[PDB]
Design a protein around this ligand. Sequence first.
Ligand SMILES: [Zn+2]
Ligand SMILES: [Zn+2]
Ligand SMILES: [Zn+2]
Lengths: 1164, 70, 144, 89, 48
Amino acid sequence: MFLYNLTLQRATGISFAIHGNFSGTKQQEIVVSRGKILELLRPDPNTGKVHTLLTVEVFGVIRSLMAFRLTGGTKDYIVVGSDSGRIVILEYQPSKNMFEKIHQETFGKSGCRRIVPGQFLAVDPKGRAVMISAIEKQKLVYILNRDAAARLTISSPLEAHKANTLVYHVVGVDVGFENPMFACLEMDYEEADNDPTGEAAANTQQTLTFYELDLGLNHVVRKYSEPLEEHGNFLITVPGGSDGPSGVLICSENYITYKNFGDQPDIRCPIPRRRNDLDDPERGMIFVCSATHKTKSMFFFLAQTEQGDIFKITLETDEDMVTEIRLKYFDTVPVAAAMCVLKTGFLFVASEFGNHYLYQIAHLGDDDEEPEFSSAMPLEEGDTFFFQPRPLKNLVLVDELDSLSPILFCQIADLANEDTPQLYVACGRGPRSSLRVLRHGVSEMAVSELPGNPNAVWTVRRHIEDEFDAYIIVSFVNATLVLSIGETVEEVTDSGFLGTTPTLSCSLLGDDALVQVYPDGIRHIRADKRVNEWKTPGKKTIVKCAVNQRQVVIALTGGELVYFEMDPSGQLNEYTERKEMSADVVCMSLANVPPGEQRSRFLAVGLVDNTVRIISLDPSDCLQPLSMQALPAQPESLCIVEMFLYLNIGLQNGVLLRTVLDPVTGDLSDTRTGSRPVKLFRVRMQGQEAVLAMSSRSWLSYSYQSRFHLTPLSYETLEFASGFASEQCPEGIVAISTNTLRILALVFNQVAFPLQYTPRKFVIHPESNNLIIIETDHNAYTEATKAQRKQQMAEEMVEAELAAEMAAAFLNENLPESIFGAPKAGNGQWASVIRVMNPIQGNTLDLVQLEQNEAAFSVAVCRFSNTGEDWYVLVGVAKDLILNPRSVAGGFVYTYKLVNNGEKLEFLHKTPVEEVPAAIAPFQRVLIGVGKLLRVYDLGKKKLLRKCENKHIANYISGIQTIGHRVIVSDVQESFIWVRYKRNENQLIIFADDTYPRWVTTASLLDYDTVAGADKFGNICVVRLPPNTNDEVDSQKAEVIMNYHVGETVLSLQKTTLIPGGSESLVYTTLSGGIGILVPFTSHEDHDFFQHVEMHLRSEHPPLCGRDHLSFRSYYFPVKNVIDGDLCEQFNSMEPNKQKNVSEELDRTPPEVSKKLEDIRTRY
Amino acid sequence: LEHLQSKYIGTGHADTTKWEWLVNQHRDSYCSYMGHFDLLNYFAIAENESKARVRFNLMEKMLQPCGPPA
Amino acid sequence: MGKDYIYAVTPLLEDALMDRDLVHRQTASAVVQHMSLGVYGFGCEDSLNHLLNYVWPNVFETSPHVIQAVMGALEGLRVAIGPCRMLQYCLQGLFHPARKVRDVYWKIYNSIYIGSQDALIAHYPRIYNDDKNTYIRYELDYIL
Amino acid sequence: KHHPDLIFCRKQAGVAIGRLCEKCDGKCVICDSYVRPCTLVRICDECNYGSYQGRCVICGGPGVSDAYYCKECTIQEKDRDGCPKIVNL
Amino acid sequence: CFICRQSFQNPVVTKCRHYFCESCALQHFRTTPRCYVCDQQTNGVFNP
Ligand SMILES: [Zn+2]
Ligand SMILES: [Zn+2]
Ligand SMILES: [Zn+2]
């Protein structure tokens, strides 16, 4: 079907990151590639919080990311190596807040091929050349030169391809002002393939090959080739020149060796291990994340250990040879895949799981409590200085950017009481795991409500010099409340205006005296308990209140306007000239006069006789109506504001007429928005003035660039609308309802409750209505296993003194997962925990423990097939399971009674099997698939009653979906195989097969014959069976109805509506942290318009990676009836000339295309 | 034909061995798993290993694909 | 814009490919090549596979013009339909006992591998480990 | 409209720009078509440098217009195959 | 107001491509949901 897939939750897991002066100024810019979109951030180090400056989606897979600066350039250009064959060097433009491609040179074919260059990217340290090398047998280096206009003039690269020469890592060395050179970790592969005995594979080793780029000779030659004994898993470059020696450092398992260009001391420094670590010593510690930070004079490096602690090493170069490297553990940080040590007190570490950490490095790096191991310090080649886990002392963590990557399982439902449904995703790795519930409100992250039932909410500030509203008066007919703008809105009596009477408005018009319109009249009230009140015009109370800087017009019934001007003493003086309008003015506002004028230029009051009168507030033109605005119906409100100035009169019906507020009468244009009266007032939103008309829908006519446009907003149900400003956001839209205030950011708040181990699957019980989640951190030590290992270490090191106390301290208080990482090891061991989280709160109301070698995979909590209506849950756990390679013992299915109405995980019994029964679903009995054998076994309390099992599958059944008399199972080879579930006939016959090979890891049946699959290469394929297919037959294929590539490995998919109302689409959650909804387009004309807009945007706006959008969306298999919403979102973000060209090509308007995209987004 | 077409990665001939084709397929699978961020995250975060540790394991497994030739 | 007329010209090309003369087969192969390159990315792969079911028997021709048309049609079909169906067509004949048949199949597979080196890893067949070396990768079996 | 001979360079492309004479103007450099000239032609090396400056990337006349790839050859991205200048071997 | 043959003030066009006065378009949108020109689905929109 025609599906316009749009991603709602963006993936935030940064696979790689670089940093430097990429912003073109003194502010530090760090660009992190979070998948298909790269985000560049220039956050303030004084605040300490990390804020993304910009983000651009390139629609491709980046294999290597790097940045480089030219000679004397203040901007660091970013060279991106993507899956496409065009290497793109771009320069960020801060005026447009986006990256502009300086050059894009094609090298080879697209995709991540073996001989295609782009797997490794490096640049010269002098800004001379950039080298791109493949994973094997291909390398090139193009000389980068400055042009006459300081432009990056690229050159033709020189060929550096050698037969059977794999590359592990490469870096351009600092050669100073001489010809540049680059070192690579080459590894021969010809002798390993030629020799069949495998002796040459053991004889092979990594070699450091430094090739010098002879720029004068216009050739590339290998300068030095030094064979290394240790295999290079990483490589770093020491800062040459004035910051130290010019050389490289290769890291391995507890061995870091530094070598310079020529004869240097090979200081094979061992890694500083933790003080009595609970992890096993078989797993070697290597510098996984390396960050070399060069100061003005000296330089240093930061490395990641096996436990994840950031260790700072000084550069004791001493101008001769690599003598010492003081490897001391500077801080304890989380499990970070990459860490960057910026200047000006910034240190960004991108966590592979959980929240990335942006710390403020206030100290010089010597503020560490851990011990220091030096390369010049001798040892017995068995241990180093035991660096104990110190706290965040040298660098204090100032920002914790929460990332959902990696994602395990998710479920979205409206079980909680909120404006939007809650999507709870159980995710994480090891002990760093949580269930994050996300819900929206618009962005109602913080909920603030005015006290009582106020008639109005007006900010009566203490003074005009104070930026924040000191007393937001929520005023009713009976009383009033004072709530400050600090996201702590509650009732107080610190206003000082004494608002016991019914106050219509109270706004800080004066410098320190707020003008308040009330039934007493117009009162100038200061911050203290003083209020000078002048009477309204006539005996009637003031109903319309035009508020400005110096002159405030109070219009009572009959249209009689009294002008209160700002006196030189700070009080308000009533004008001696007054006149009546055509009818009684309902509401009013005054335009923003300039600072040269001593009064308002035009104050407009809207009467009930379908007219609005705008009069000058000066004393020379007092009581003289200048501008007449002809309202369509009888006006319920009026508002005069900027954009010169315009006055709009809104009626009780859906018609508001806006005219030009001036000394002459302007033309009135009538526009429509909710069967409610108008309460329009001046507010600020998105840098533009607006008048928010009170209706059922959030309608606010915003006058941006002298264009008044009114559109609905995606807020909750309300009867009035206004602006809002507090500590949560600088400018937002407040939709006021019956004792409620929806907040619109003119995102969804997610809260993560932690779990025990890494989650595998979440199951909601039918009786309990609570999530019985299973956490299984495999290939790691269990909590009981870590306790037994700590007790064994305490028993081993008890015999010595201080070693017994150190062993007892390490057993009692080991390295925590929140700070220094939980020390876990092993392969067959697995941390397993079954936790019951209630629908009210995500805390564990129950806890069930398994064996130390078992990982729970099957999560299904429902009623028992063998028993009655008792919710007996069968949970499958595979014991002694090793991922790489295949090494498992067997899978045990445990039946649990689920006591306390499912709130207690009371395990009844268990039954083992040789295969892995990770699939267990209800099927008339219950379908349990162990290995390739799926059996309709009744859910017994002690053991299951298997009746008939068929082992005709290819490898296994990772997921089975059923709707009645049929079960579709996803195998390793076939994406979906449908077998007729004849439980009454007790016969298993495969009704439908497939021809497209896909390792489907998800299932979401849109119909009985429709099966969805999420392949291992990140391809979403929805395949329907052929019509008129016999259910009791075989050898029949299912045609792929739709196929697309989402850019990430899709984990789960469910055919359910992820938003309240709208479109019942299908929501799929990926393993990289992305969630997308595939909305089926039921309109052929809208699908044709979207296809024409996509065909216009594919040529008008090329991708940043250089790959085609159709090539990126159809990388594995060809696309079929799939529309990507990323290009439709990026079409609205284009330039105005490009939007005009796209609208001329689409034969429509750019605002109409934006409205159609907004309607497609709001369809959900 | 072309010399670089026969010299390309994944190329073969009429007398190409099955072990050589399987080793080339395994080396291409290892290179595709190393190049792709999502495939490396799916094959890395499933176990309790780091991303660079998984990259080093894949670099060792690339040489291990030429481990037992015939 | 040809996707409205692919279903119209499908039986004409099917009748043209079954002709005795090599000129009809060569020019119909050019038709399949240009039609495959024209409406790529539009879900018309069923008729393209149906035309490939007549094109792929004609790969044994010896004249250079018709075999150049066959190679161009195979390249266009590998672009349009995808490399998975071309790999399915070539996997049962790459290890053919005949020298010339396996040579032609290896030429087609080498062209497909030059065009689709990256995408052939996910479309590689599921073969288990044998006595020479391990073949089933355990990284694909890992689930997070 | 092709010949079985005349392999071109099979060299890595560079910053030099292709150039077409009027006798074979408008043709695709690979498949010899006339539809949708999309991608510019890069001619790698000393095909441009020296006495062959601004010459034809086809037969050898004095070039007047920029050579282009068609959209059909760039559908499979054959434009990254290398230099398309004919060397008579 | 092309039916009553009267004067038009502040002219505007509705969703049914009919141009009339703003008060006349407001009265036509309040009285009926559809326009009186060709019974189009203007949905009572009183917009410029
Ligand atoms: Zn020519
Ligand atoms: Zn062409
Ligand atoms: Zn050339």
